[PDB]
């Protein structure tokens, strides 16, 4: 009763039939589990270690049970299509990885725990798999693009008026550390950490779930900032808890911000995150909600840069960042001031280099496939 993507499976079978019946081959698996959709990538390998074709599909999923069932079904279809299981598999999930489980933060709350044991061995063979956080996987994808000297094709300095970037102005130094943040359904955060010798490690973070502090009592917009922080505590938690960065820096958080802006307008109607991002030019409430949404993204990055004294750069990543580039560039001055000026430790941040993604790319799946490639020991 689980519908396999027919186009995907026919492509895999057609490729097996035309190209793989009489040569040695393997395949590695990369799975990108977001809060509302999961992507599966199959990368074939021939000639011991050469990339062959990659095939991808995606399905709606927001419970752990459904995710386990879909992965089991895709494992059986793959074995049926090409005659054997994968050589290695990597899965990245939108939650904190603690040992042998992940709690997928924005899956339905009654069924968000996914365990290592729910991986099908057909796609994740024993001792040949990794359990990753989604933003952690993006970091490995970013490292890998950096190694291939293409980081400046996907990111530019936030103040690049014409998106100009070079291998000199956008690069990863193996003696530096970088924060990565990506606003989507949730606020993903992580650290890329260099080691002399060109090696990079990734530190997973859950900074999207630390509490937002209120600005100083004599700061310019104190009254409104505090009013919003209290309004949202009431709305999201009944006031039992204060808000996290993700309660503003997310799709649902953008919608909450808009509802705050329109709260005293009896004629205003709430808008979805998409409608807000599309209509900020003609709807001043949407502009203000967008400004708030991205201002607190800057504060989240500022919080990490104060927390991590060796943090030298920050990458604002994700497809949403690319989609909102016009808004971001039009309000650059406001967002730089938020990042660099609104902390008494601003002199610690003077040299922080911020970058924004300027081309769509699935760094998650890229990180997964590279991790699986290493595990496969080709
Ligand atoms: N331009 C936009 N700006 C901000 N948020 C947006 C925008 N468009 C959509 N959203 C919201 O952002 C979320 C989707 O972000 P996206 O990057 O596509 O996915 P994700 O968080 O990485 N994972 P997934 O839920 O599986 O798609 C939803 O909550 C949308 O309502
Ligand atoms: O998807 C972005 C982020 O969403 C958050 O709610 C999760 O807790 C993180 O683990 C994830 O990286």
Nearest CA to ligand 2 atom 2: 188
Looking at the fold, whether 127 and 93 belong to one and the same domain comes out as: yes
Return the CATH number at 318: 3.40.367.20
Q: Which ligand is nearest to the CA of 205?
A: 2
Q: Are strands 37-46 and 101-103 parallel, antiparallel or unpaired?
A: unpaired
Q: 38 lies in a domain?
A: yes
Point out the ligand 1 atom lying closest to the alpha carbon of residue 34: 26
List the end-to-end C-alpha distance of the chain, in Å, as a whole number. 36
93 shares its domain with 231:
no
> Which of the listed residues 320, 322, 331, 365 should we mutate to test ligand 1's pocket, taking the one with most ligand atoms within 8 A of CB?
320
- CATH number reported for the structural domain that contains residue 31 in this entry: 3.30.420.40
The number of the ligand 2 atom at minimal distance from the alpha carbon of 136 is 12
In terms of DSSP bridges, do strands 25-33 and 88-93 run parallel, antiparallel, or are they unpaired? parallel
Structural domain contains residue 180: no
Q: Which helix (H) or strand (E) holds 148?
A: none
List Cβ neighbours of 178 (8 Å cut-off, separation of 6 or more).
172, 191, 192, 311, 312, 313, 314, 315
Residue 180 and residue 313: Cα distance in Å, rounded?
A: 9
Cα–Cα distance, 358 to 317 (Å, whole number): 9
Instruction: Kindly state if the Cβ of 206 falls inside 6 Å of ligand 2.
Output: yes
Q: How many whole angstroms separate alpha carbon 324 and alpha carbon 364?
A: 20
Q: Are 185 and 251 in contact (CB under 8 A)?
A: yes
Q: Is the CB of 274 under 6 A from ligand 1?
A: yes
Q: Which ligand is nearest to the CA of 94?
A: 2
Residue 283 Rama label (left phi>0; alpha psi -120 to 50; beta): beta
- Closest Cα to atom 7, ligand 2: which residue? 95
Rounded to an integer, what distance in angstroms lies between the CA atom of residue 14 and that of residue 81?
Answer: 9
Ligand 1 proximity of 230 Cβ (cutoff 6 Å): no
The DSSP output letter for 108 is -
Same domain, 213 and 349: yes
87/372 Cα distance (integer angstroms):
8
Q: Does 54 share its domain with 111?
A: yes
Q: Is any ligand 2 atom within 6 A of the Cβ of residue 134?
A: yes
- Alpha-carbon 121 to chain mean position: 26
Is 188 a member of any domain? Answer: no
Query: Closest residue (by CA) to atom 15 of ligand 1?
Result: 184
Q: How far is the CA of 106 from the centre of ligand 2 (A)?
A: 8
DSSP string, 339-363: HHHSSTTGGGTTT-EEEEE-S---H
- For residue 159, what are the CA distances in angstroms to 30, 154, 173, 200, 305? 34, 15, 20, 26, 19
Which ligand is closest in space to the CA of residue 320? 1
Residue 181 covered by a domain: no
Query: Is 96 near ligand 2, meaning CB less than 6 Å away?
Result: yes
363-376 and 134-147 helices, crossing angle to 10°: 80
Q: Are 111 and 65 in contact (CB under 8 A)?
A: yes
Residue 166 lies in a domain: no
Residue among 92, 94, 87 at smallest CA distance from 35: 94
Q: Is the Cβ atom of 185 under 6 angstroms away from ligand 1?
A: yes
Dist CA 236 CA 2 (whole Å): 35
Rg (CA), the chain: 22
Residue nearest to atom 5 of ligand 1 (CA): 251
Residues 237 and 114 in one domain: no
Q: Which domain holds residue 267?
A: 208-357
Whether 106 and 134 share a structural domain: yes
Residue 165 within any structural domain of the chain: no
368 and 310 in a single domain? The answer is: no
Closest CA to 153 of 138, 143, 163: 163
Q: Is 318 left (phi over 0), alpha (psi -120 to 50) or beta?
A: left
Residues 6+ apart with CB under 8 A from 31: 38, 39, 40, 41, 71, 89, 90, 91, 92, 123, 368
Quote the distance between the C-alpha of residue 172 and its chain's center.
Answer: 19
- Give the whole-angstrom CA distance, residue 210 versus residue 247: 10
Tell me: do 88 and 220 sit in the same domain. Answer: no
- The string over 257-289, giving b where at least 16 C-beta atoms fall within 10 Å of a residue's C-beta and e elsewhere, is bbbbbbeeeeeeeebebebbbbebeebebbbbb
Q: Which H helix or E strand runs over 46?
A: strand 37-46
Which mutation among 35, 39, 104, 185 tests ligand 1's pocket best, with the greatest number of atoms within 8 A of CB? 185
262 and 223 within one domain: yes
> Both 352 and 367 in a single domain?
no
297 with 162: CB under 8 angstroms? no
Task: Give ∠ CA 202-206-210 in degrees, rounded to 5.
Answer: 140
- Alpha-carbon distances, residue 235 vs 186, 231, 264 (angstroms): 18, 6, 15
Burial of 157 (0-12, 13-18, 19+ CB in 10 A): middle
Q: How far apart are CA 115 and CA 124, in angstroms?
A: 13
Domain count along the chain:
2
Same domain, yes or no, for 317 and 367?
Answer: no
The alpha carbon of 183 and the centre of ligand 1 are apart by a number of angstroms equal to 7
d(CA 250, CA 270): 16
Centroid of ligand 2 to alpha carbon of 246 (angstroms): 9
The whole-angstrom separation of Cα 163 and Cα 302 is: 23
Nearest ligand by distance to the CA of 132: 2
C-alpha to C-alpha distance for 212 and 233, rounded to whole angstroms: 11
**Of 313, 358, 363, 315, residue with least CA distance to 137:** 363
DSSP structure string for 168-194: TTS---TT-EEEEEEESSSEEEEEEEE
Q: Give the ranges where the chain is alpha helix by DSSP (H).
A: 6-15, 64-82, 134-147, 151-154, 222-237, 251-261, 273-279, 284-307, 319-323, 325-330, 332-341, 363-376
- Which ligand ends up closest to the CA of 105? 2
Closest atom of ligand 1 relative to the 273 alpha carbon: 31
Tell me phi and psi for residue 294, to 5 degrees. Answer: -80, -30
Does the residue 171 lie in any domain?
no
Question: Do 243 and 219 reside in the same domain of the chain?
Answer: yes
Whether 198 maps to a domain, the answer reads no
Q: Is 135 in the pocket of ligand 2 (CB under 6 A)?
A: yes
Where b means 16+ CB within 10 Å and e means fewer, 13-40 reads eebbeeebeeeebbbbbbbbbbbeebbb
Q: Which atom of ligand 1 is nearest to the CA of 323?
A: 1
**Rounded distance, CA 172 to CA 89, Å?**
27
């Amino acid at each position: 009763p689980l519908v396999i993507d027919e186009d995907f499976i026919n492509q895999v079978e057609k490729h097996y039939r035309k190209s793989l019946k009489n040569i040695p081959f393997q395949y590695i698996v990369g799975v990108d589990v977001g809060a509302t959709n999961t992507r599966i990538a199959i990368q074939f390998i021939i000639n011991e270690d050469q990339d062959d074709e990659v095939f991808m599909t995606k399905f709606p999923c927001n419970t752990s049970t459904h995710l386990a069932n879909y992965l089991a079904a895709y494992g059986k279809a793959m074995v049926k299509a090409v005659g054997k299981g994968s050589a290695a598999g990597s899965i990245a999930l939108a939650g904190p990885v603690t040992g042998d489980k992940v709690r997928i933060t924005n899956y339905k709350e009654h069924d968000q725990e996914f365990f290592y044991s729910q991986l099908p061995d057909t796609l994740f063979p024993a001792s040949k798999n990794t359990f990753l956080n989604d933003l952690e996987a993006s970091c490995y994808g970013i490292i890998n693009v950096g190694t291939n000297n293409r980081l400046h094709e996907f990111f530019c300095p936030i103040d690049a008026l014409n998106n100009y970037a070079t291998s000199q102005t956008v690069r990863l130094s193996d003696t530096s550390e970088y924060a990565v943040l990506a606003m989507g359904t949730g606020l993903g955060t992580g650290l890329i950490v260099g080691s002399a010798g060109g090696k990079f490690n990734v530190i997973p973070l859950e900074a999207g779930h630390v509490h937002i502090a209120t600005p100083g009592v004599n700061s310019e917009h104190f009254k409104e900032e505090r009013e919003r922080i209290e309004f949202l505590s009431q709305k999201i938690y009944g006031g039992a808890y204060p808000i996290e960065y993700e309660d503003i820096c997310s799709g649902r958080g953008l919608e909450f911000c808009y509802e705050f802006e329109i709260r005293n307008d009896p004629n205003a109607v709430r808008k979805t995150a998409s409608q807000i991002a599309e209509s900020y030019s003609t709807d001043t409430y949407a502009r203000q909600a967008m400004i708030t949404h991205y201002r607190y993204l800057m504060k989240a990055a500022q919080n990490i840069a104060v927390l991590i004294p060796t943090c030298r750069g920050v990458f604002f990543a994700g497809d949403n960042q690319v989609f909102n580039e016009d808004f971001f560039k039009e309000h650059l001055s406001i967002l730089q001031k938020e990042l660099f000026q609104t902390h008494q430790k601003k002199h610690w941040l003077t040299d922080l280099k911020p970058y924004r993604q300027m081309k769509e790319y699935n760094f998650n799946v890229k990180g997964c496939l590279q991790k699986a490639r290493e595990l496969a020991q080709l």
